[PDB]
Design a protein around this ligand. Structure first.
Ligand SMILES: Cc1cn([C@H]2C[C@H](O)[C@@H](COP(=O)(O)OP(=O)(O)O)O2)c(=O)[nH]c1=O
Ligand SMILES: Cc1cn([C@H]2C[C@H](O)[C@@H](COP(=O)(O)OP(=O)(O)O)O2)c(=O)[nH]c1=O
Lengths: 134, 135
């Protein structure tokens, strides 16, 4: 199961543009937009999962390597094009690594920041899935 | 003052984080998120106004020099910080200039793209506004 989303990209003498509409070219309604920039150090991030939240992750500059695990398959994806979106469904584990220095990462979430929706134990994630599986 | 937006930025060992939340640190509901990149050239962008659309421009990388006009007064602000947003309301003429080479410009909008919400002629815009004032 592929999670990548290629967005229609407009081009011209001016540059590029990519438009992202809730419930249109994305499975959900947008309620939060966030982004990580001016990164340093060599520690990855993420390593969590969400029970309700739905997201789409995009690398708008530079690139970063993403690992997705839906409890079925672990997928690794290097993002380095603002035209490629990565769908991170509920009950899916994710991690960011290899954040280039000029990297800008953006995330579109379907819901406000909720610390309580966050699974922080890979192992617990793995379990939560099982149950889900029955 | 009512146009410029200061987003709470989070800085740590790892980097910086900024989260925008519909109707939280922005006056409207996000229906679409668009962005410009891989720019090049010396021909600007924008030069129109929208009738109902509410927007917010954010320079995620490099810089951009923007112009605003609500018919009334003219304003200019150079967006170069991911933490700064710029509110662009209905009936506001606008222009984007000087995109740095490494510029990423993002825009959060109230609704989906709609070719018909635009005013691509300044005079009509001016008119548009006049017509409004009377009201
Ligand atoms: C993603 C996100 C983060 N934040 C805050 C949460 C933290 O205080 C900070 C970064 O945390 P985050 O990278 O999500 O997790 P961690 O605890 O491992 O650092 O940014 C928000 O306030 N809202 C959001 O939507
Ligand atoms: C902003 C935006 C533009 N577009 C497309 C429509 C146009 O063919 C193209 C150009 O955007 P625009 O700058 O608005 O106009 P113009 O090309 O006349 O200067 O972008 C979308 O499809 N969706 C969007 O959300």
């Amino acid at each position: 199961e592929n999670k990548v989303i290629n967005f229609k990209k407009i081009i011209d003498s001016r540059g590029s543009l990519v438009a992202i509409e809730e419930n249109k070219n994305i499975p959900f309604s947008i309620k939060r937009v966030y982004y990580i920039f001016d990164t340093k150090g060599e520690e990855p991030r993420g390593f969590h999962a969400n029970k309700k939240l739905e997201q789409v992750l995009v690398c708008l500059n530079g690139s970063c390597r993403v690992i997705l695990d839906d409890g079925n398959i672990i997928q690794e994806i290097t993002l380095d094009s603002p035209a490629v979106g990565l769908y991170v469904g509920p009950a899916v584990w994710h991690e960011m690594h290899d954040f280039s220095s000029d990297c800008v990462m953006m995330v579109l979430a379907s819901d406000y920041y909720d610390e309580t929706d966050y699974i922080r134990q890979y192992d617990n994630f793995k379990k939560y899935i099982a149950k889900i599986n029955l």
